[PDB]
Symmetry: C3
Subunit: 114 residues, 3 copies
């Protein structure tokens, strides 16, 4: 799986250990092996949500399977929870796009998961 978070929150406000916490929480939530988890955080971004530039975040979670109605609601609660707790971003100022990737469309180690 791959989780990306883009936010206008400054770098200095992203607490130490955030990438590790995301990796650990996502491994368990998705059920995927920790070695399969990739995380990416992009702070200090120029963005707005509803026209307001108060703290907000635009994210994406890509996974081969483990994507669905119920699972996505659970990931959203988990992720919005972490963003609220660690980056002080209100859950209603966070969007998370979920993508269920076909194995044939994910490259890794000179090949694909197909």
């Amino acid at each position: 799986p791959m989780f990306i978070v883009n936010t206008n929150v400054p770098r200095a406000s992203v607490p130490d250990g955030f990438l590790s916490e995301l990796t650990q929480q996502l491994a368990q939530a998705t059920g995927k092996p920790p070695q399969y988890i990739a995380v990416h955080v992009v702070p200090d971004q120029l963005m707005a949500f509803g026209g307001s530039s108060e703290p907000c975040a635009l994210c994406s979670l890509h996974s081969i399977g483990k994507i669905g109605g119920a699972q996505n609601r659970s990931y959203s609660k988990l992720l919005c929870g972490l963003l609220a707790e660690r980056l002080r971003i209100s859950p209603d100022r966070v969007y998370i796009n979920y993508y269920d990737m076909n194995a044939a469309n994910v490259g890794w180690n000179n090949s694909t998961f197909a």
Copy 2:
């Protein structure tokens, strides 16, 4: 909806009110409330379009519905128009990927839109 613009144009060349203009114009174009419109601009990028690093832009517009053949053509005219006017980027050096998202695949406020 969510609109992201990645460009090699420097931050100082992004005029005041750009995020606000995009928010307003996209709310009107998509027919969605501006409160639900998120915009993100990423300047000073290392990119090339067609083998040259002259001003260019790689963008994405995600929306639950309001995506289609005719609508996308209309959005492209609007967006390329804004990028040319405000960032001086030639329309033929702009790519905009459109994504019609299923409500279950868009997280927000500890849940999804499903």
Copy 3:
């Protein structure tokens, strides 16, 4: 086509002409004219792969057609090879998401490719 590389490797480590090499290599691989190839490299990113902060990369390749099982395996070998030789990133620490875009969903020059 559009190729994006997000990586934690330093900007100073990205060889000059790297964008040009990616452009020409992708033009050859996809069979499409270099004029239509866009490349984007984002260094100095805060990311982790498998919980580790060692060099890694999260990439995407979007193309109208020329995407598939066999082709993607070929693209992965090509791209991982380039990232390894030029950016010193191990292939097993690289993810590449492939997207076969419908022409109606790719905006360009005030319209779409449909």
